[PDB]
Amino acid sequence: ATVCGPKKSTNLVKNKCVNFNFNGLTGTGVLTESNKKFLPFQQF
Amino acid sequence: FSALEPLVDLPIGINITRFQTLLAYYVGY
Numbered sequence: 895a896t897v898c899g900p901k902k903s904t905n906l907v908k909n910k911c912v913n914f915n916f917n918g919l920t921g922t923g924v925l926t927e928s929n930k931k932f933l934p935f936q937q938f
Numbered sequence: 939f940s941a942l943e944p945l946v947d948l949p950i951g952i953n954i955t956r957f958q959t960l961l962a963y964y965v966g967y
Contacts, residue, residue: 896949935944 911924917937
């Protein structure tokens with residue numbers, strides 16, 4: 895499909911056990927900052 | 939050896955059966 899609806903975004907909270915919804919994939923974890931280097935097309 | 943990065947993604951929804959090139963080039967499958 896082409897004309898999809900809007901998609902809201904919440905505030906990113908670090909160092910807490912949270913339920914994340916980064917794009918499509920969900921899960922439960924603690925989002926801490928990392929020293930990893932992604933390629934610019936890679937999201938996950 | 940080389941790696942080809944995805945840059946452009948087009949949700950076209952159209953069947954493609956043939957192709958041609960507009961102007962040495964090499965064509966595989």
